[PDB]
Amino acid sequence: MTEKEKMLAEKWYDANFDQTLINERLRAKVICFALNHTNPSATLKRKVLIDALFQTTTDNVSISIPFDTDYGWNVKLGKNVYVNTNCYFMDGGQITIGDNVFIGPNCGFYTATHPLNFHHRNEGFEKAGPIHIGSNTWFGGHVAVLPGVTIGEGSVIGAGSVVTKDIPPHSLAVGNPCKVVRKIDNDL
Template sequence: MAKAIVKEFGENANIIPPFTCDYGCNVKVGDNTVINHSGVFLDTNEINIGKHALIGPKSGLYGAIHPFDVEARNEGIEKAKTINIGDGAWLGGKVIVVPGVSIGKHSVIGAGSVVTKDIPDDVVAVGNPCRVIRKITEDDKINPIRKK
């Protein structure tokens, strides 16, 4: 069903319903990406999500920009900017990404964050507004115990 809704939908990708988008024709989802339940994508411009990305539940990617001027807003005037989510990025639950933002590959965005500016590769970023708190390091790796 997802392949009928969005423009590009990668192999082994998954959208867990419910899922809401404005058009769908502006959404590209990479291979092995998971969009958890209650995602809202306002794709008035492109929303590009890389491979192996995780989008937490109740997250919103909002491409539309409405004018501050009430008269223009009342006339329905708006513009939109592209949102890019890099390969392997992880957005926690209830993350909001505003128009024109890019999140770098492998970066982690803490739950409840509001991402208003670009986030570089390989960092942990949190807050409202979202800000980088540190690089992802070797100490962040989990070494699972494997059965032989």
């Protein structure tokens, strides 16, 4: 297996020293750099860059600059996704985002796990844990989501939350560590 294949299979992979992965990360860094230095009124250029980054034709995916991602193509997006300033989608592990998702400023979605043992970590090994973001969700600013976490559809994450564990659908959750407060009635 290639290191990319191990990454996409939730296996330990040489994230730091594999050349194809370094190249793919460089591609995404370059696109982000371009995007982050494109005047917000250059609507067309921004759209092009976003589409190039995610390698898809986006439908109302609004990215407020700056933005960062590791691969870009490993971020699966729905329609009507609003990303506020300075978010980071660390997508070694696939980041799946549904439709109608509001992401606050300074949010970080982290899929990388390093070994706790420094000997293994120093060799550059990582293990990617996918993040699933349900449709119809809202994240306050300053939220961090850890590897392997699922946030259920219709849920609300309060500002400053550190989401270490799965959040059920239609739930209001806040804190460090993030804990469910109550359920939300999502009906007329």
